[model samples]
Target: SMSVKKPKRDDSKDLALCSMILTEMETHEDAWPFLLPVNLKLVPGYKKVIKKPMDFSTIREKLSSGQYPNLETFALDVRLVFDNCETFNEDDSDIGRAGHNMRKYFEKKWTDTFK
Candidate 1:
């Protein structure tokens, strides 16, 4: 039997980051030039296109714990983060590529996930 290992993720941390990013996008329509706060300690590669500030530990703690209602809701929020990046930059841009990559990542995992 072929088996696949689930990618290790700090689900809370990941969800926290998503919440923070989505919140930031809500305030600012286009978030490319300035993404989430610099203090966010986000995953690598994002720094190349954006800056950060403000600690979001409090926000992260609160949102990550609550259920997302469904993956669709969670996915939309997550997708918004990348969409902001692509919207400000060209669709073929670096962050844009990263966005697609992230989306694909979720799609693949979602296949076996939330089942």
Candidate 2:
């Protein structure tokens, strides 16, 4: 039920995805590991939450995990899931936990990068 049923086709959707990014009302740097411009302070001290940097090497590495979504094509998917998730069995859940587990996996692999 949480499918990304957009009004457009995947090709068009992908093109639109790349277009919003390519626009130049302002300027931006080369795409980093991420692709969207979202504020990601997620904590205090960042008086100003800036845009989200592009980061997607992990997306490429494990595209078939069904565990995490690719930032490249799934910038909005996480929020979508969190917004519209349905658990048939309340005793067990696997949606948000996917994010937590993915975080652990990434922290293990890129502890140095973050530091």
Clashes of each: 4, 8
How high is each candidate's TM-score?
Answer: 0.42, 0.22
Candidate 2, residues 45-82: lDDT per residue as tens digits?
22242232222333323233544333344434322222
Whole-model lDDT values for every prediction: 0.50, 0.33
Superposed on all Cα atoms, the candidates' RMSDs to the truth, in angstroms, are 13.2, 17.3
Q: Could you tell me the lDDT of residue 22 within candidate 2?
A: 29
For candidate 2, the 10 contiguous residues with the lowest summed lDDT are 24-33
* Tens digits of lDDT, candidate 1, 1-115: 2687777644545554456454653454333333334332554654554442222233344356775654466665555555655644576776566556655654555554444
Best by TM-score: 1
Model 2 spans with C-alpha error above 4 angstroms: 1-92, 112-115
Q: Which of the numbered candidates is closest to the native, going by highest lDDT?
A: 1
User: How far off is model 1, as Cα RMSD?
Assistant: 13.2
